[PDB]
Each structure stands twice: as C-alpha cells, then as structure tokens.
Symmetry: C5
Subunit: 248 residues, 5 copies
C-alpha cells in the first residue's frame, strides 16, 4: 500500500518557474524518447524480408517503452500533456530540453559503437529510417505531425484513468504502436533519429560503408540544415496542431 502512490504523485505537472527542474525533467524525456527509438531500431534490424506491416508493428510496440518511461517516471515530453484542463514560454523550455536529452543520447549511442551491430545493419537501419523522414512535402510533414501527436495525447489521456502500473503502462502500447508503425512524425523522436543518422553519415568508417554496401552520398539529405527545414519545423507545427486538435 501507499509507497506506490507516494512515487506517482511526485510524477505529475504545472508549477511554472522554477524551470531548471522543468528543463531537467524535459532532458529526461528526451533520453526516454531516444531509448524508445533505439529499441525500435534494435528490433527492426534485419527485418527487410519480413512483411512490412509486421516488422513495423513490432518496432512500434517496442517504442512504447519511451512513453511509458515518461509517464511512470514523470518526465516532461513536449506537448504530450494537455490533461491541462483547469503556456508557450514553458513549451520553449521543454522543447529545448527534450532536444538536449536527445542529443546527449545520440552522443552516447555514437560512443557505444552500436552502429556496427549486425555487421553494420543497425547503423544502416538508422540511416534509412532517418532518410525516409527526409522526403515529405511541407503539408505531408505537418499532417504526419498532426497524426503522431494526436496518438501521443490520447495515450497519455487514457493513462490517467489508470489505477495500476499495469493500467497506465499497457493502455499506451496500442496507440503508440499505431503511430510509430504507421510512420507518423513526432518532433522529439526525430531529435534523436535524424541527428543519429547525420552523425552516422558523417563519421562512419570506410569499413562500415563496404559492409553495408552504401556510401555517405546515398544519404545526401541527412544534414542539420535539411533536418531543421524539411522535417523539424513542419513536424513541430504539426504536433502543436495535433495536441490542440482535440481541445477544439
């Protein structure tokens, strides 16, 4: 009894300044969403000959780890809440902190050697997963953002009816799996994925490219500039509309 509800009241929201503590909960969320994406990449590595949809579904289930970590630990994920029924200066704080968390996990994943796993296939999986996010028209990217954050917010929202750990965790699997297998776009998730792809594209050894049968040229859209303009901006706009789409 009691120990459990102690740990999860300390997980929750909406004292505005002190930030810093908010900035640190948001770094935490960036690390959790980065975990989700690494899990996804691990599970879908080598699944090129499975049925498309089945691979993606399993990657999706695995990814829900990230959001579970955010809700049970009480980290602060950009616009993931909006069970704020009783703003934007605070959003900037969370966003920038999400970003730092994600970039810290990129650095750590890079230092681990993991791109070489499965004879380079893990790294190529990152290269292709990131590259596929790079070819949307602006309207597409905004719409895929709308869809992703819709699902994240509904997941979080259901979580509240939760009484047990089981309830709060597992009610989030299906909607999270749904957006991730469907390839909807979440901006914070992308702050890990596309950077991770950029780092791999720029610092992979000649050996890696031989092993995987590609070259850094095959991935010409993975650049910080292109990332910001072609993905991050229109996706982020899309996530805002997405999380807002419900309220109205």
């Amino acid at each position: 009894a009691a120990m459990a509800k102690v740990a999860e009241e300390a997980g929750v929201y909406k004292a505005t300044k002190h930030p810093l503590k908010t900035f640190y909960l948001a770094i935490t969320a960036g690390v959790f969403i980065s975990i989700a994406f690494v899990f996804y990449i691990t599970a879908t590595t080598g699944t090129g000959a499975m049925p498309y949809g089945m691979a993606k579904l399993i990657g999706g289930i695995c990814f829900s780890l990230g959001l579970i970590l955010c809700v049970i630990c009480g980290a602060d994920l950009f616009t993931s809440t909006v069970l704020i029924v009783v703003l934007a200066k605070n959003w900037l704080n969370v966003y920038f902190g999400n970003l730092i968390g994600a970039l810290l996990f990129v650095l750590l994943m890079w230092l681990s050697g993991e791109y070489m796993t499965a004879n380079g296939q893990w790294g190529l999986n990152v290269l292709q997963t990131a590259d596929h996010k790079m070819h949307h028209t602006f309207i597409e990217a905004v719409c895929l953002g709308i869809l992703a954050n819709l699902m994240v917010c509904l997941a979080v929202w259901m979580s509240y009816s939760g009484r047990s750990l089981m309830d709060k965790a597992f009610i989030m699997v299906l909607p999270v799996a749904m957006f991730v297998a469907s390839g909807f776009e979440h901006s914070i998730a992308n702050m890990f994925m596309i950077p991770m792809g950029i780092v791999i594209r720029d610092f992979a050894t000649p050996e890696f490219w031989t092993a995987v049968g590609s070259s850094p040229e095959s991935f010409s859209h993975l650049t910080v500039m292109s990332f910001i303009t072609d993905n991050l901006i229109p996706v982020t706009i899309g996530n805002i509309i997405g999380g807002g789409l419900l309220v109205g």
Copy 2:
C-alpha cells in the same frame, strides 16, 4: 435476488438520447475519428502480408483494430449503435420514435463527419505511398473486398459485426480497471474484423479512403503497385452507398438491438 437495473439502463438511455446539446454530435465526430484510427492501424499492420497465412495476417490486424473501440469506451466517445442498448431499449417506455430518430441520426451523421475528416487528413499525409505504394494498394483491396456482397450477404455481415461490437461494450461494463475495460474488448473485436464482418462506421472511413486513392493516386503510384484505377471499378460514392452502406447499416441495427430484445426475454418480471 433480482437486480432489474434495466431501469438504470433505460435512465442512462433517456439522458443520452435527449439531453446535452451537440455534446453528442461532437462526441460522435470523435468516435468517427477513433474508428478511422482503428482501420488505419489495421492497414499498417497488414501491409505486405500477402505471403503470410491468410488467417494470421487478419487475426493480427484485428487485434490492432481494437484500439478504436478501446479509444471509444475509455474516452467516452459516441459510436453508432455500438454498444448502446441504452437508447434502443430505453424505448420500452421513456422515448418516442421521433427522439430515437433525432439521436441515431445525430450520431450517425457525426460518426460520418469524423470518418471523412480523417480520410482528408490521411490523404494529405501522403500515407498511401508508404511501403512503395503497398499501404495504398492495401486500402484499395480492403475497400474493394467490401464491395461485392449480395444485399442479404451485406445485411448479415452487418448483423455479425455489430453483435460483436455490442458484446464487447457489454462486457466492458463488468470492467473494474482500465486493464479490464480495454482488454476484454480485444478478442471479440479482433474476431469481427479478422472474419471481415461489416461495420458501417468503419466502412465510412475505409471505402471513401479507397475512392479517394483510386481517383487521386498519381501515375507513379499505379506503376509502383502494378494496378490501375480500372482494377477497382466498384469504388464510387454511388456504389458505396447502395451496395455497402445501406444494407450494412440495416444489418448493424438488427445486430445491436438483438442483444437487448434478448436481455428482455431474460427479464420480464
């Protein structure tokens, strides 16, 4: 001792059927979005599954589909006849044919508007081009397989589907937890969707999405997937309404009012 909370069932029915303004219309739009989500999930999971055993691919897609009903029940959105013995029974005293009309018509038309908005939003997303067009093709095929039933067939598949949705919601009521309410619905929903039973609201998403793809897909899409608009000739607004929506909706009504016209053969004092 006899607990005859048909009363509570009816009383619930009277509020839902006549009360709050467009709260209902707005909740029904929300349910249309949720059932759209469910079918999008089914398409994603089953994209590229052509070579898997038929049943397995369908069984998986059906589990995924259950998200939609989970969404509806847990968030309190309004899904046409689904389940609501509430409203149907609950006319058995307290409600006039005219009010039922107003309401079923209100929820239906809202369910549709949600569905059509998600159609428009999926189409703007570019999703049809996913997996080298195989996502799109999957929608075309799924929609087309809903287009060749006789009238009797389509009514029956509709009875079967809505029986399942209603048993799912009915079992939900015994739910004590979130875990309880959500997961008790997985098996009966998966059953209806894997066996290709027909639900009108789900089809308000699926068939229009098929029509939209057929009419607006680029030549690049058709070359990629090896097909043509002509290969799905039945996907038209007119065919949808007369060969699917009409008979399937009739079927759904027979199928969900059955559960009650039946709680009764087991109440009558």
Copy 3:
C-alpha cells in the same frame, strides 16, 4: 463505489425457471459457435505453417467463446459442473441438462444459418469454407472409444477453466485464466459436443449447398466429404462425444 459488480451478480445459476434457462442456453450456443468461427478465421490458409503453431493460435482465439459464456453468464452444457458443488437428483438435474443441451443446439444452428446467409464460406477464395469442411470431416473418423475419450479430454479442460475462473476477482482474472486450458483442448483436437453442433452442421450445409464455382476454386467435390451427413454426425460423433463430455466433467473421486 464501483457497483457494477451488479453485472457479475446478474450472472450465477442453480434451481430454475425453465424457459429462461433455455434462453441462456441458446446464448451459449451462439457464443461457442462464435469461438469456432474465430478459430476457422485464424487458421484459414495455415496449411504451410507448423501444425502445432496454427492449432495453438486457433485455440487462443477459440477461448473467446467461453469468455463470452462466463462473463455474460450464458448456460453451457455441463461446464459449471465443478462449481455446482459449492438437490443432486437423477430426473431433476437431468431435466435441465436436456433443457440446456437442446438450447445449446438451437443457438448453434441459428448461428449456422446466419453464417451461411453471410457468404463467409467464399472467403479467401473459398479456403474459409474448405477449412470448415476439413475441420468437420476430421471429427468424423473416430472409433466409438476414441470419440468418448476425446470427449472426456475436452470437457475436463472446459470444466477446469470454469472452475479456475471462480477464484477470479477481476475481468482480467476471469477471462485470462481460461485462455491456456481452452487453447490446449482445441489445439489438441479434443471433442466438445456443443462446439460440434456448430462445426459439423456447418460442414454439412457447405457440402450440400456450395456452388460449383466453390468446388472448383478449392479443388475438391462434395464426394470428398461423404461422412458429412446428419445421420453420421449423430451416430459417429455427437452421441459418443456427449457421453465423453459427461464422464469428463464428472471426474469427482473417493
């Protein structure tokens, strides 16, 4: 509080109004037929999969039926036996066995009619219907002793499932504790009489009323399923299996 454990009180059962027992039994027939429909869906096209794996998945799906029975309080033939030791007569307890049994049959056959009207058998280029034909025909070749024993085996499982469900406090407890025992008996091909009242009639109806186009698509003929007849169903399956179920549900000892 959370009263709607008024729903689970709304269930129960012993000493009776007769026609209200007949309706819950129809209900149970409908539920088990659903189970079997589910199974045939899941396993259609699974010819190439490893035998046991296809069977197991089919068995997990099947458990819907029993879940539907217990959580809804429908009346399934000799399924709550163990429970019913919680006034024993052999013309009174037997009087409603017959009532439930006959009720189960009506539900099953109403589901057979409805599935047939649905066109379902044409699903998967006729493989759904062929699945039904083959599933039923495999239950038609047992020697009398085999059938009784597959009957004991099957009902032993169903009774144990229902029994365990009693310890169940949540919907999760009650539904999920039955998935393993039910999956086991379905996937092992044990024989449940009521489930049979759906499957075999279903096969008969297909064998008899399928179009020529169906036989050509699936590459078989009504001659390849000569044991699918109402007379063979009753004598070679339903009788011995039912006997079997009875013994099965009653392994009480001293």
Copy 4:
C-alpha cells in the same frame, strides 16, 4: 494430517502435469523447420498450464512447494505424493492412448512423443541429476513467487516465465517424465504398422524406450536431482 486427501491430490497433480506435457506436444508438433529455441519457448509457455492448474486448484506436486514448507522429517508423504503423482500420470497415459491422439497430424503427434521421450534417455547419470536440479529449482522458484500473488492473474502468470525456461531448456522433471516416457513406451509398443509407415520410422529406432531403462537411466537420477534442486 489426512493421508487420502494427500494421495488423491497427488493423483490430481499427476493428471495436471500430464496435461502440461500433452499441450507441449500439441504445440510443437510439426515444428521441425522452426528455429529450435522458438518452438521450444512456445512449447514451454504452453506447459506452464500444468503448474498453473496445480497451484490454483491446490493439487499436490512432488517437492514443490518446499521453499515454503520451510516457514527434516519431510520424506513422510514424499513417498505418498510421489506414488500419487505416478498414478495420475499413468492414468493420463491410458486415457491419451485410448483417445487415438498419437495418430494426429498424420502421425506426427505420436512421433513427437517418441522423440521427446527418447531425447530424455541418453543422459549420463551426472547429466540427469543436474538437469533434475535445474528443473526443480525453477518449479520451486515459480511456486514461491506465486505466494506473493494477490490476484488469480498474479499467481498464474508469474509462473509462465520460470516454467517456460525449464521446459524449453530441456531440464528434467521426474513427474513430467512419468507421463512423457511411459507415453513413448506405449506408442513404441502398440503403434500399428500404418503409423510406422506414415512417420517413416520403426519401433527399433527407439530401442531405449523400455520400463527398465526408464527407471534406471532417467527416473532415479532425475528424482535425486529434483530433491537436491528443491533444497538450495
């Protein structure tokens, strides 16, 4: 302490563990082209039924619990339970044989039994004892975790992983073998010539399947193993 509650609950447990094994055989029939570990793992999940049955229904399975029944005179009804378990297992062997199941999946079901049983017959005595320790450690751990359980969910599902581990890994449980090897012997000795043609083997190919070999090569060392395994 009433000794015929005990002897009958033990029979009940032998029935449950035979059920467990049958389920496993069903699941794994035809799985020869599946990756080894995957088939075994699924087979192992299926098996957990038996122990779930034992715990929720309160049957009496030889030397688990025991981690709990320490919260030296024990051997008392160890003999009683053990002999009980055997009768349940052997009764199920008779019932399975009467059912015609060995002919399932064109004889593959039976051949699956012959092979699973034969694979238990080739251990050195030190091997059999050790797989015996490993098996019963897991059963006993499972049953111990079960007590923390508050719901039916808790008690049943906390046992799936540790049981699946022991079965998939091929550790040796004496009572489960009381079903599996007997079943194999019966099939070997009585299967019709149709069956041997169907599965393309012969009773010769399973020479070790005999009551005497069973006792000396598998039952005695695995039982010693389960007792040591149950206390650590």
Copy 5:
C-alpha cells in the same frame, strides 16, 4: 515530500545491514541473472536465419525472468536498484561503507554466477540441439570480447541505466503483475541491443571459456568450429577487455541516477 529521506534510510539500511544475509542474497542474484542468460541462450538457439532484431527481442523478453526473480524474491543485484545505497550515500554511509558492500554484493554475484556455470556444465546442456546451444554460448560470449575500452564503458552505462529504470518503475508497482511486467520492456531493450551488464557477463563469458576449454572433439565436429576460433575467451581477457570497463560503465550508468532528480 522528500522521499530522498526514506530512500536514504532504506539506502543506509541496505548498505549497513545484517551480516551475510546480504552475501546470501547476492549469491542468489548471481544465480537469477545466470538463469536469465541461460533462458536467452535457449530461446535464441538456432535463430541464425530469423531476422536479427526479432531473435534478439525474443531473447530479451526471456532474459527479463532474471530481474523479475531478483525483485520479487528480494535478491541483491550489483548497483540496482542500488539507486538507494549510492544515491543517498550523499549524507550517511562512508566511502569505507559504500565500498564495503558494493564489494560484498559484487563478489557474491560472482559466486552465484560461477556456481551456475559449474551446474550448467555438469548438466550437459552445451550439447543441446546438436551442439548449437553451446555454439550459441561461444558466439554470444565472443561478441562481448571485441569492444574498445570506451565502447565497453558506454555499453555498460546503457545497460545499467535500463536495469535501474526497470527497478525504479517496479516501486510504483502495487501487484505482482505490476512489478514483474513493467520490467519486461526495459530489460528486453538492453539485452536485445547488446548493452553490457557486468554480472550477466560473469555468467556468460566464464560459460564460454568453460565450453571452449572442455568441449569434446565430438562437439567441435558437430558445430564445425574449433577452440582456436574463440581465442579471446580466457580469464585474463575477460577481466581486462570486458569485466573492468563494463563494471566502470555500470557504476556510471546507475549512479547517473544520483545526479538525476536534482
């Protein structure tokens, strides 16, 4: 609401604690983590032709048995969740104290792992699946032997981050269901991704060394390899190329949950 006080005190308690109840419990944890890795090897034997990620994912789910066993039974696993002892030997507990028992648990974990190695070896298990089980152990162990020091430290950080988060979430658990199942995903994630846990490695690499050194000629012919093909499997190489940098990594990884919170 400072839980930092209760956890510190629970911290202080566990680090200071009844005699060799903690030694006993650490041996117990070494046995549990060995069980986890055995399960993983069983599940993934013969999975060479499955998609990489899928085999690893399934193996990872199976592995989670170990941590479940640890948490539900209360065994003592090195630095987690010593989220306690460490995080909140800011205050009480000396360097002399936090060492006295990290060292106690660590050495206990090792003894448990090594006892399980001996018992697995005596069981004959390496011959399972026509030697593929043993080959699976050889390969799994060998893949942990080719990291640069910085790589091994980082894989250590990653692994113990996940173990600590798993155990941390477990605290919110009210049921057996809650506590056990909330750990499946984070443990599966680390194991499938090949992150490095020191105690798990105290089973896996010794197991590999034992197989390499004592396998019969029949085993090598069956699996089509030789002891030479696994030249890095030695006690010396284990210690310097894996155990040291991974352990350093695990400490940073779990302690990083100190600095966190504040």
